[PDB]
């Protein structure tokens, strides 16, 4: 509350560490469905169904331009990429399996880096 604060967690490395995680996601072999925005002209149904499209390149631009106020907003966009993927793709498809794998990969890096 006013003049009553928990001890200050060091957040000065968060930007660099989120960049490193994102590099590792970008370079994973199953990253291909997620690297670029879904082409809303060429993929029927995507525009209407997925209210908030997200992809790694868009996260990279937002990161590089100070559009994440803190590490939680960064994790919310990463998770959005995988939540979108599950919304649009069957579990038993290459892209559906890609999303589950990437989410797992992300969550481990996240826990090991910050928890």
Method: X-ray
Q: Domain with 93 in it: what CATH number?
A: 1.20.920.10
* Domain coverage including residue 2: 1-115
Burial zone of 42 (CB within 10 Å; 0-12 exposed, 13-18 middle, 19+ buried): exposed
DSSP annotation of 41 reads: T
Assess contact for 57 and 35: CB atoms under 8 A.
yes
Strands (E), 1-115: none
Assess contact for 29 and 35: CB atoms under 8 A.
no
- Cα–Cα distance between 35 and 50 in angstroms, integer? 17
Instruction: Indicate the resolution in Å.
Output: 1.8
Domain count, the chain: 1
- Residue 81 to residues 2, 7, 13, 78, 106, Cα–Cα distance (Å): 37, 33, 24, 5, 11
Q: What is the distance of C-alpha 26 from the center of its chain?
A: 10
């Amino acid at each position: 509350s006013m003049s009553v604060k928990k001890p200050k967690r060091d957040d000065s490395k968060d930007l660099a560490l989120c960049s490193m995680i994102l590099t590792e996601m970008e370079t994973h072999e199953d990253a291909w469905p997620f690297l670029l925005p879904v082409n809303l002209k060429l993929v029927p149904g995507y525009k209407k169904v997925i209210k908030k499209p997200m992809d790694f390149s868009t996260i990279r631009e937002k990161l590089s331009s100070g559009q994440y106020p803190n590490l939680e907003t960064f994790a919310l966009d990463v998770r959005l990429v995988f939540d979108n993927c599950e919304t649009f793709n069957e579990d038993d498809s290459d892209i559906g399996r890609a999303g589950h794998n990437m989410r797992k990969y992300f969550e481990k890096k996240w826990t090991d880096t910050f928890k």
